[PDB]
Design a protein around this ligand. Structure first.
Ligand SMILES: COC1(Cc2ccccc2)CCN(c2ccc(C(=O)NS(=O)(=O)c3ccc(NC(C)(C)CSc4ccccc4)c([N+](=O)[O-])c3)cc2)CC1
Length: 145
């Protein structure tokens, strides 16, 4: 709660900055710090390895003004259908970023605000329970820092 929310905005703003665009950055606003970085690099290397797979993921969802949060959670469960894991999770963050980057290409920067929220809810009702039973995020940074 809250904490995870900060990570989203950070990861999002970061993914956007990579494409030139910008937004409410959060690299040194709240806390975490190490986590934000660990997750930042991870998402970068992750996509680099699975450039093909992920490419299909983003194509399995076209976020639009008339899109229900359900559709989103439906596409995020398929990945976590065979149990949750640090890696598969790292993708979730990347998935949200892609959808956002696409929302900006179609002149729709008012969606990123909604996408960020959707990720927060899904994180605090599907991943939070697990992350807590895996040594919190501190473990993710200690293993994949
Ligand atoms: C086809 O099924 C898939 C593709 C897919 C299916 C459906 C929808 C979307 C995608 C499902 C998604 N997927 C993978 C592939 C591997 C793992 C994996 O190795 N997980 S892990 O828990 O073993 C791990 C390994 C390495 C790192 N970090 C390193 C050491 C820095 C390497 S870079 C990296 C980062 C994060 C994840 C993986 C690599 C981290 N981590 O940082 O959390 C975590 C997880 C999902 C590709 C196949």
């Amino acid at each position: 709660s809250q904490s995870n929310r900060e990570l989203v905005v950070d990861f999002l703003s970061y993914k956007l900055s990579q494409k030139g665009y910008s937004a409410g950055g959060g690299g040194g606003g709240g806390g975490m710090a190490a986590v934000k970085q660990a997750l930042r690099e991870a998402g970068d290397e992750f996509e680099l390895r699975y450039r093909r797979a992920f490419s299909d993921l983003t194509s399995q969802l076209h976020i639009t003004p008339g899109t229900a949060y359900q559709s989103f959670e439906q596409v995020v469960n398929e990945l976590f259908r065979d149990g949750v894991n640090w890696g598969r999770i790292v993708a979730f963050f990347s998935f949200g970023g892609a959808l956002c980057v696409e929302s900006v290409d179609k002149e729709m920067q008012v969606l990123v605000s909604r996408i960020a929220a959707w990720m927060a809810t899904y994180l605090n009702d599907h991943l939070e329970p697990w992350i807590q039973e895996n040594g919190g995020w501190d473990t993710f940074v200690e293993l994949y820092g």
